[PDB]
Amino acid sequence: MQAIKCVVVGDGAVGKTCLLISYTTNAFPGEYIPTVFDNYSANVMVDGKPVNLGLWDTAGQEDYDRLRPLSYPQTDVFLICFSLVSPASFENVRAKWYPEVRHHCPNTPIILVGTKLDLRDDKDTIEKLKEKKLTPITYPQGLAMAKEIGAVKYLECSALTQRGLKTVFDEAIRAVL
Amino acid sequence: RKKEFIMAELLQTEKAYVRDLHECLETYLWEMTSGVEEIPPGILNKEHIIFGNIQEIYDFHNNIFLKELEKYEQLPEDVGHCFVTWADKFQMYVTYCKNKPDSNQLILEHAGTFFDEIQQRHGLANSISSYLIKPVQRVTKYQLLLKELLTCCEEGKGELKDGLEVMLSVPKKANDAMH
Numbered sequence: 001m002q003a004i005k006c007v008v009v010g011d012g013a014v015g016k017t018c019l020l021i022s023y024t025t026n027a028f029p030g031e032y033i034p035t036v037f038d039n040y041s042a043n044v045m046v047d048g049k050p051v052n053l054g055l056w057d058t059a060g061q062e063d064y065d066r067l068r069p070l071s072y073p074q075t076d077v078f079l080i081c082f083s084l085v086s087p088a089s090f091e092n093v094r095a096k097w098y099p100e101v102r103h104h105c106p107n108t109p110i111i112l113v114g115t116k117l118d119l120r121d122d123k124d125t126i127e128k129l130k131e132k133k134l135t136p137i138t139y140p141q142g143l144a145m146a147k148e149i150g151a152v153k154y155l156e157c158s159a160l161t162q163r164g165l166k167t168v169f170d171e172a173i174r175a176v177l
Numbered sequence: 178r179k180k181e182f183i184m185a186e187l188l189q190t191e192k193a194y195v196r197d198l199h200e201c202l203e204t205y206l207w208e209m210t211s212g213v214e215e216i217p218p219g220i221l222n223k224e225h226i227i228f229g230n231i232q233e234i235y236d237f238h239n240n241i242f243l244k245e246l247e248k249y250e251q252l253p254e255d256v257g258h259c260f261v262t263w264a265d266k267f268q269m270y271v272t273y274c275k276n277k278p279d280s281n282q283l284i285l286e287h288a289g290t291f292f293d294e295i296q297q298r299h300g301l302a303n304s305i306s307s308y309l310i311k312p313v314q315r316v317t318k319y320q321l322l323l324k325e326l327l328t329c330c331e332e333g334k335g336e337l338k339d340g341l342e343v344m345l346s347v348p349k350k351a352n353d354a355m356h
């Protein structure tokens with residue numbers, strides 16, 4: 001049965017840990033958001049064919065440019081993440097994440113994921129951005145960034161509402177099969 | 178209440194880290210050193226390169242660090258001092274990180290499926306590679322937990338600042354030690 005290593009990368013603002021917990025437990029953690037998600041694996045069926053999906057978090061390593069790539073070798077698919085309500089995280093896809101992932105894993109598929117979809121229409125979030133002369137990241141901005149990096153898919157999700165979340169991981173697996 | 182969830186997590190995850198290193202040593206390492214099985218010439222007598230100083234990392238956590246973290250369970254606001262006290266022991270993660278690229282290539286180029294057959298036979302969800310990244314993960318995670326304690330503990334909380342300082346310095350020093 002096919003084994004799949006999926007590494008999740010991106011800025012601290014994406015909520016990587018929260019993404020993975022919400023995905024694996026089928027719920028936003030709400031009460032308390034754990035800082036630790038340990039390397040995880042589970043059998044899922046995609047398009048019939050069952051698969052063993054391995055998920056590794058990278059939260060904590062955002063400042064350690066030489067430690068991050070210790071997790072990269074033999075990855076089958078990367079999720080390069082940014083938060084839809086952080087323009088700086090979206091630009092870091094280009095400035096930080098894509099270059100290192102390419103440098104170490106030139107032929108590994110990338111899914112581009114925008115997290116925090118539920119905040120893109122939230123008044124307070126929008127206003128807080130307006131005060132910095134910014135706006136949330138919209139769909140065509142994601143598509144264009146996806147083309148620029150060679151991403152096989154651009155997907156948007158919320159850990160909070162579950163919207164698009166199960167799809168992210170289905171598609172990670174499809175990008176390997 | 179928030180400082181309590183963070184301390185609980187610190188502890189639950191410390192226990193799991195100790196259990197994870199123990200499994201790594203007693204399955205993947207033990208099959209190499211035992212003399213129960215045929216070891217590829219590619220890796221023979223090269224367990225020091227594969228596992229780095231993970232034994233010594235494990236002894237620290239399992240002999241000392243987890244018992245001391247437990248003692249701070251009702252003193253979450255003081256736990257930064259635990260890191261200060263044991264700062265020197267964390268220097269072993271510098272050695273471990275330095276070695277890890279050499280470890281990974283050695284397993285790649287020379288172990289073929291030795292460790293995968295061990296994994297299958299023992300029925301482990303985690304591969305040797307999944308276990309061997311854990312020290313890298315754990316040493317970059319303590320600073321996240323301490324930062325979270327800073328957001329919910331008073332100015333009688335430079336018993337977090339100095340801890341966090343140490344736990345930012347260790348991974349940076351490890352990072353800067355890489356080629």
Ligand SMILES: Cc1cc(NC(=O)Nc2cnn(Cc3ccccc3)c2)no1
Nearest residue numbers: 014015018019030115116117158159160
């Ligand atoms: C990784 C990720 C997060 C996400 N969407 C969010 O986090 N949404 C969000 C953030 N804050 N709130 C209010 C809140 C916060 C904490 C506890 C209770 C209420 C709503 N989508 O992907």
